Amino acid sequence: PVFENNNQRYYESLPFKQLKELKIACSQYGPTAPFTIAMIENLGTQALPPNDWKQTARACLSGGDYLLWKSEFFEQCARIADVNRQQGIQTSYEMLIGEGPYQATDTQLNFLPGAYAQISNAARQAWKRLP
């Protein structure tokens, strides 16, 4: 996730215990079981750059579910990016999905503060549409 100190935005790795528990939940209950979704909602309250959501999905979902998630995540981001464009908000599609010039985690740390909630919304909407 993304944090701030007095001088800069910086990145810290996802807490391992939370990630492990989510992986186990996906395997033991399913990716959209109530317990699993509760954990996704909790993760959704943090400022995850796109790569943290992609890492989480890759770690926790089956290969097949990962690609279903990723495709829907991109669609959700495209929707949000279109709204941002109309509203003059400087958060783009490639920023939201973390691709193109924004592929590397180090380039995902200085978005508008509100971008991280948008990313979270897209990621969680995509997760909730898994079968």
| CATH (domain of 42) | 1.10.375.10
The two structure tokens encoding residue 91:
């958060």
Placement of tokens 């492990």 in the chain: 20
SS3 content of the chain, % helix, strand, coil (to 5): 65, 5, 30
Q: What three-state secondary structure class fits 112? A: coil
Q: What is the DSSP string of 36-91?
A: HHHHHHHHTTS---HHHHHHHHHHHS-HHHHHHHHHHHHHHHHHHHHHHHHHT-S-
Method by which the model was determined = X-ray
Q: What three-state secondary structure class fits 4? A: strand
C-alpha distance across the termini of the chain, in Å: 27
What CA–CA distance (Å, rounded) separates 98 from 104?
Answer: 7
Q: Residue 20 sits in which domain range?
A: 1-131
If one counts the domains in the chain, the total is: 1
Q: What is the resolution of the experimental data for this entry, in Å?
A: 1.5
For residue 54, give the DSSP letter. Answer: H
